Structure formats: structure tokens, C-alpha cells
Design a protein around this ligand. Structure first.
Ligand SMILES: [Ca+2]
Ligand SMILES: [Ca+2]
Length: 269
């Protein structure tokens, strides 16, 4: 039996799937710890920029978790992603330890822009700005990639890099009450929010696990962007990014929530 995690239904993904929108033909790169082979995922390709782990398989579990929120297959097992037909690429920029260098992250973004990815999911971040990173963000953007990044889990009133950069779409996390989760960073540069508490998804060892973090909120928006792209194949990263914002549900302060909760129902109309 397949269950639909609460955040998937919170963002109204099923409403989009009932219209024929599942992310089919949209390429999404997950820059993280890798993606393990899983029966509820279809991994199309990828690369590792982690010296010492040439493989794209996930030794941490974080990337596999992220990937399942975007694109867990719509079938009779496990869970269901926001864009279950998206073409998934495993871009390994963090090691098993769950950390990596800006150098690896920059290479992964370059890779994405060279391989015609539509959306890049960066569920990672630093409190410190990086010129290398910023340049990579900007270069992927001008190659048509929509970069989506987590605001960070420090709970502070400023957001992480690269989500802080203008060309990154910064995602914070809400709870089941539609409140900002305590750990979700907010402040200037924050674009939108999505479910981030108790998120159930695919996990290595062919299983499922629930995690919390802005890292879990991000993939709901990457997924929502694939739905929109499928519906409006001619739209640019910018067009997609503003439509998501314009159609999000207001939750109170733009300081704490940016544009509001992403809404894939309102967006694919
Ligand atoms: Ca499934
Ligand atoms: Ca931003």
C-alpha cells in the first residue's frame, strides 16, 4: 500500500496529479549526499564531486530522503513525491559524513547547468557567504536552472548561503499547524515555505524514515516547480519562481514566511 505523506497533501500535489501534472519531462538534480537505489525511486543518472566516493549511492540517507519528497514513484508501495514522473539525477556534492566543500557544490551546479537540468535542489547551506558558490549559483541560473535552497535550521532571523543569494529561491519550513517551525531560518531573501516537520520519505536500505528540517521543506518546492514547468514548458526559471510565489498561500509576515506556503494546486491552474 502507498501512503501520501502529510506535506505532499499539504502542498496539494494530488490536485495537480489529477490534472495530468506529474513532472514528466522535467529534469531535477538533487545536490546532496547521493541517492540510493530504492524501489520507490527512478534515478536517471548523476555524478559525484566527492573525492573518495566516486559512486552516486547515498552513504548518509539525507539525499535519498530529499529525492523521495520530490519524486517518489506513484505506484502501490512506499510513498508519493510532489512530481512522481520527474527525471531524477543524483548529484553527490556532500560525503557520507553529510558535509562537503563549496568546491564540490560549485562543480555540481556547473554540472547541472551543463546537463540541462531544469531544477536544482540544494538542501544544504552555510551561515558564511562564498564567492565560488555565488558564481556557480549565478552561472546555473543563466543556463536556465531554477536553484532552490534551504533557509537553514538555526532558527535565526537571517538565512543561509546560498539561499540568501538573489538567484536562489530560499525555502523555509512550516509545521502541521501552518506555523513556522522553530528551527526554520527567516528574514531577508526568504522566498517561500513548505512542510518541514515529521516528513516521511524514502531512505536507504529500501525503507522509509521521517526527518525534520528546512532540507525537507525545499524538495516540496523543487517538486512544485517541476509540475509548473510541465504545464508551461516555455517558462524560464524566473517565470516559474515568480508564479510559485504569486500563488502561495499567505501565512502571515513575509519576514517569517516570504510569499507563504507553496500551493501546487493554485500553481498548476
Ligand atoms: Ca510509491
Ligand atoms: Ca533568496
Amino acid at each position: 500500500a502507498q501512503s501520501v505523506p502529510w506535506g505532499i497533501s499539504r502542498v496539494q500535489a494530488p490536485a495537480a496529479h489529477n490534472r495530468g501534472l506529474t513532472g514528466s519531462g522535467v529534469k531535477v538534480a538533487v545536490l546532496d549526499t547521493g541517492i540510493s537505489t530504492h524501489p520507490d525511486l527512478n534515478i536517471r543518472g548523476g555524478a559525484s564531486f566527492v573525492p573518495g566516493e566516486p559512486s552516486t549511492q547515498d552513504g548518509n540517507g539525507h539525499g535519498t530522503h530529499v529525492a523521495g519528497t520530490i519524486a517518489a514513484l506513484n505506484n502501490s508501495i512506499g510513498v508519493l513525491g510532489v512530481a512522481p514522473n520527474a527525471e531524477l539525477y543524483a548529484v553527490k556534492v556532500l560525503g557520507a559524513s553529510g558535509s562537503g566543500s563549496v568546491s564540490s557544490i560549485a562543480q555540481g551546479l556547473e554540472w547541472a547547468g551543463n546537463n540541462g537540468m531544469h531544477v536544482a535542489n540544494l538542501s544544504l547551506g552555510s551561515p558564511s557567504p562564498s564567492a565560488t558558490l555565488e558564481q556557480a549559483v549565478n552561472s546555473a541560473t543563466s543556463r536556465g536552472v531554477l536553484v532552490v535552497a534551504a533557509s537553514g535550521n538555526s532558527g535565526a532571523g537571517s538565512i543561509s548561503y546560498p539561499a540568501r543569494y538573489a538567484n536562489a529561491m530560499a525555502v523555509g519550513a512550516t509545521d502541521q499547524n501552518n506555523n513556522r517551525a522553530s528551527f526554520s531560518q527567516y528574514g531577508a531573501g526568504l522566498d517561500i515555505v513548505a512542510p518541514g516537520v515529521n516528513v516521511q520519505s524514502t531512505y536507504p536500505g529500501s525503507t522509509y524514515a521521517s526527518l525534520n528540517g528546512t532540507s525537507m521543506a525545499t524538495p516540496h518546492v523543487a517538486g512544485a516547480a517541476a509540475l509548473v514547468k510541465q504545464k508551461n514548458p516555455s517558462w524560464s526559471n524566473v517565470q516559474i519562481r515568480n508564479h510559485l510565489k504569486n500563488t502561495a498561500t499567505s501565512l502571515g509576515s513575509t519576514n517569517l514566511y516570504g510569499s507563504g506556503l507553496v500551493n501546487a494546486e493554485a500553481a498548476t491552474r
